[PDB]
Amino acid sequence: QHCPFDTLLILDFETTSDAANQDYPCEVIQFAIVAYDVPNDKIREDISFNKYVKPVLNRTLTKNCVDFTGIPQRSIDTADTFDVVYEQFQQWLITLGLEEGKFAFVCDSRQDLWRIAQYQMKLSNIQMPAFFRQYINLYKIFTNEMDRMGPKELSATTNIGKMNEYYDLPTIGRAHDAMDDCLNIATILQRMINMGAKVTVNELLTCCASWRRQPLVYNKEWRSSFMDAGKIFERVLPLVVTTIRAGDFRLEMYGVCRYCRKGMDVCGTSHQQTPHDLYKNEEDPIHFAKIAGYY
Amino acid sequence: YQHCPFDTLLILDFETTSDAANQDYPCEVIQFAIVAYDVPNDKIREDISFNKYVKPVLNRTLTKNCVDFTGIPQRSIDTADTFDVVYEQFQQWLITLGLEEGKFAFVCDSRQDLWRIAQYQMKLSNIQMPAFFRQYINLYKIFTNEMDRMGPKELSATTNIGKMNEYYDLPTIGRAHDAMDDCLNIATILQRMINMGAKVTVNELLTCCASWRRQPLVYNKEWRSSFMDAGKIFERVLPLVVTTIRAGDFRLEMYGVCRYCRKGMDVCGTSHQQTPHDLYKNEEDPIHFAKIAGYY
Ligand SMILES: [Zn+2]
Ligand SMILES: [Zn+2]
């Protein structure tokens, strides 16, 4: 109906972390997808991908990480590295015969594709594919929907939590298992569609933004603030998030950078707005940028 | 006369990667520090020292709690060499000193530095454990005996060094858990001990075999949050085991032959002699540090 895609792929990544430190080189440790069949309004749990991933930079999971994600150490010690798992994902995609630009990924925020996929793919030396450079931020649709229908007082802290609370849906499994997150998002998505939401891509990864032309005002305590760390990532990572209105999106924008209008084979091979102003303080280096090779 | 049979003592400290709340952790050396002590002249030689940061390979990012404990900033390890390089620099620095084989010994504040940390790091780096790490002076054990001689006090300090400074009434040097400040504290403590009657000699030896590793360990499921219980499993995982020797029983000629198998230390220690297969059965609860190190 409203959704121009015939299939939606709900995606979730879990990463290595250390709660108290934002200057951390997050590596994917779980990669999960569930398919949603748009014309039939059906969640297809039988069409799914669920792999653990062995990190190479930080091989031992932090305790706060395992408490948060619920992933135990054993599951990543027996896992393949990202480059192998991503290849399996590419292969699995092919064995589903979807048409380029007729499926889109759905996430609960900008974190999975703008930050996590982008950063992991630098580590693994993989080109950001066109299907990650265009996606549905479900939480952005949700806030438009709240605005459209009627805001109410929410006490949940996570994106998934609030959406579940607002639509009055029971929490599935537990927070932060990648597959459980996927199922929650899928059930929310379905509900949003039944209530008349237009679910379509709303975020695009772009080589440039005029607001990056102004040097970031450096907050020296950024390493303990999620918001302030976000500002650093925005500058360090090549691709930036540009929003698009539902009515302005077209399926033919697939594979085409919204900013420079070139194909995504040419756009994205090198950073067009390298933050040299952040890179001259030898006294206070940005660890995640150093270890990935941004400088 | 001189109760200490060595001509020079090497005070060693390691700092490692860590994650306070998890003891199933592949500790990697991130600081390697040494200060020399001249025995016949009773002098701490602060000018004869080794002090290097080390870049880990398995856990390249220090946890915040590791940073807070050791005081080591991330930038200092990002710019450092890996253990194999730093260890090679140590070997080279050692030869510069011009020391007679078996006439110098290492000094630590516990069994941790050489029994656990060095042994483990050296399995990761694939370096053979040297003779001068397989016999050493555990100063805290000597300290423990010295308290029986002179009479015990009620100590409130919490670290081994803190205790030793408290008991002998010495001021704390620098900051705790900086490898070099620890070395300086240990050297000063050592000096006081010898001057106050202590018999300072090799008291600990690393051996390939012990009868108490024949009987499978009484497995504690919650071992990962307990320092003592994790020690018990490290004792089984690590090939070489700590064996104590009385002061009057040590002989210089014990370098570098194993107390159990009586073979040179170039032959002993290549292969675990008491592999704890009983511990390696359950793929639903595996020992992480034993797995990444390649013990199974
Ligand atoms: Zn572009
Ligand atoms: Zn032996």
- For residue A281, the Cα-to-chain-centroid distance in whole angstroms is 30
Q: In what order do the strands lie in the sheet with B81-82?
A: B81-82, B43-55, B29-38, B8-16, B104-108, B135-138, B204-207, B241-244
Whether residue B128 lies within 8 A of chain A, CB to CB, comes out as: no
Contact by Cβ (8 Å): B145, B247: no
B226 contacts chain A (CB < 8 A): no
Q: What angle do CA B3, B4, B10 make, to 5 degrees?
A: 165
Q: Please give the interface size between A and B, counted as residue pairs whose CB atoms are below 8 Å apart.
A: 61
Q: How many helices (H) and strands (E) does chain A have?
A: 9, 7
CA dist., res. A154 & res. A164, Å (int): 10
Q: Which ligand gives the minimal distance to the CA of B243? A: 2
Q: How far apart are the first and last CA of chain A?
A: 47
Q: For residue B172, count other CB atoms closer than 10 A to its CB.
A: 13
Tokens of B291: 């797995």
| Distance, CA of B28 to CA of B70 (rounded, Å) | 13
CA angle centred on B86, ends B84 and B88, rounded to 5°: 65
In which residue are the tokens 């607001």 written?
A: A211
CB-nearest partner of A290 from B20, B78, B285: B78
Q: Which fold has domain B1-201?
A: Nucleotidyltransferase; domain 5 (3.30.420)
Q: In a 10 Å sphere around its CB, with 0-12 CB exposed, 13-18 middle and 19+ buried, how is residue A236 labelled?
A: buried
Is residue B45 a contact partner of residue B6, using CB atoms and an 8 Å limit?
no
Amino acid letter for position B263? K
Domain spanning A1-200: which CATH class is it, in words?
Answer: alpha beta
Rounded to the nearest angstrom, the distance between the alpha carbon of B266 and the centre of ligand 1 is 60
B47 φ, ψ (degrees, to nearest 5):
-75, -20
| SS3 call for A242 | strand
Location of each CATH 3.30.420.10 domain in chain B: 1-201
**Which string of DSSP letters, residue by residue, matches chain B?**
------SEEEEEEEEE--BTTB-S----EEEEEEEEEETTTTEEEEEEEEEEEEE-SSB-S--HHHHHHH---HHHHHTSEEHHHHHHHHHHHHHHH---TTSEEEEESSSIIIIIIIHHHHHHTT-PPPGGGSEEEEHHHHHHHHHHHH--------SHHHHHHHHTT-PPPS-TT-HHHHHHHHHHHHHHHHHTT------EEEES--GGGSS-----TTGGG-HHHHHHHHHHHSS-EEEE--GGG--GGGTTB-TTT--BTTTTTSS-SS--GGGS--TTS--HHHHHHT--
Tell me which residue of A14, A11, A6 sits closest to A48, measured CA to CA.
A11
Q: Looking at the partner chain, which of B58, B60, B63 has a beta carbon nearest the beta carbon of A62?
A: B63
- For residue B46, what are the CA distances in angstroms to B8, B32, B37, B100, B105? 13, 15, 8, 21, 17
**Chain B stretch 54-83, residues whose beta carbon is closer than 8 A to a beta carbon of chain A:** 58-61, 63-65, 74-75, 78
C-alpha distance from residue B63 to each of A59, A220, A277, B25, B221 (Å)? 12, 19, 27, 12, 25
Greatest extent of chain B over all pairs of C-alpha atoms, in Å: 59
Q: How far apart are CA A148 and CA A27, in angstroms?
A: 37
Spell out a b/e string for A4-41, using b for 16 or more CB atoms within 10 Å of the CB, else e: bbebbbbbbbbbbbbeebbbbbbbbbbbbbbbbebeee
Spatial separation of the C-alpha atoms in residues B54 and B83, rounded to whole Å: 6
- Going from the C-alpha of B95 to that of each of A168, B98, B126, B252, the distances in angstroms are 73, 5, 22, 20
Helix, strand, or coil here: A15?
strand
A258 vs A8, A199, A206, B133, CA distance in Å? Answer: 21, 19, 6, 62
Domain with CATH 3.30.420.10 in chain A: 1-200
H or E segment and range at residue A82: helix A82-94
C-alpha B84: how far from chain center: 18
**CA A134 – CA A265 distance, rounded (Å):** 14
Query: What is the rounded CA–CA span in Å between residue A116 and residue B251?
Result: 60
Nearest CA in chain B to A22: B64
Residue closest to A103 by CA, chosen among A127, A136, A128: A136
Residue B296 CA to ligand 2 centre (angstroms) = 21
Phi and psi torsions of B290, nearest 5°: -70, -35
What does this entry list as its resolution, in Å? 2.5
Q: Which residue of B has its CA nearest to A223?
A: B64
**Among B101, B137, B94, CA closest to B265:** B101
A2 touching chain B per CB within 8 A: no
CB of B46 within 8 A of CB of B22?
no
DSSP β-ladder status, B135-138 and B104-108 = parallel
Of A26, A27, A63, which to mutate for an interface test with B (greatest number of B Cβ within 10 Å)? A63
Q: Is the peptide bond before B256 cis (omega within 30 degrees of 0)?
A: yes
Strand partners, A10: A34, A106
Q: Is A226 exposed, middle or buried (0-12, 13-18, 19+ CB in 10 A)?
A: exposed
**Cα–Cα distance between A114 and A121 in angstroms, integer?**
11
In sequence order, which residues have a C-beta less than 8 Å from that of residue B257 and are 6 or more positions away?
B263, B264, B265
CA angle B266, B272, B275 (to 5 degrees): 175
Strand order in the sheet with A28-37: A42-52, A28-37, A7-15, A103-107, A134-137, A203-206, A240-243
Q: Kindly determine whether residue A285 and residue B64, on different chains, have CB atoms separated by under 8 Å.
A: no
CA–CA dist A248, B233 (Å, integer): 62
